[PDB]
Amino acid sequence: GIVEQCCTSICSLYQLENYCN
Amino acid sequence: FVNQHLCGSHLVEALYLVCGERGFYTPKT
């Protein structure tokens, strides 16, 4: 989930913003 | 952007820094 999600959906700013935990 | 995706070490480093050394570094897939 969420982690592989960053490892594959280009994980950038918006990610961080929506990831901040 | 650098858009090379982020996993384990990089992933954690990455957000940690931008908005992660608030909860972060233990990302269970």
- Name which of B2, B20, B1 is nearest A3 in CA terms: B20
Look up the domain containing B1 and give its range: 1-29
Partner residue facing B27 (CB), from A2, A12, A20: A2
Encoded amino acid at B23, one letter: G
Burial of B9 by CB count in 10 Å (0-12 exposed, 13-18 middle, 19+ buried)? exposed
Distance set, CA B27 to CA B1, B6 (Å)? 23, 11
Residue with tokens 């959906």: A9
Q: List all residues 6 or more positions away from B11 whose beta carbon is below 8 Å from its beta carbon.
A: A3, A6, A7, A11, B27
Partner residue facing A20 (CB), from B6, B7, B15: B15
* Total domains, chain B: 1
User: B11–A6: do the CB atoms touch at under 8 Å?
Assistant: yes
Q: How was this structure determined?
A: NMR
**Using an 8 Å Cβ cutoff, are A8 and B13 in contact?**
no
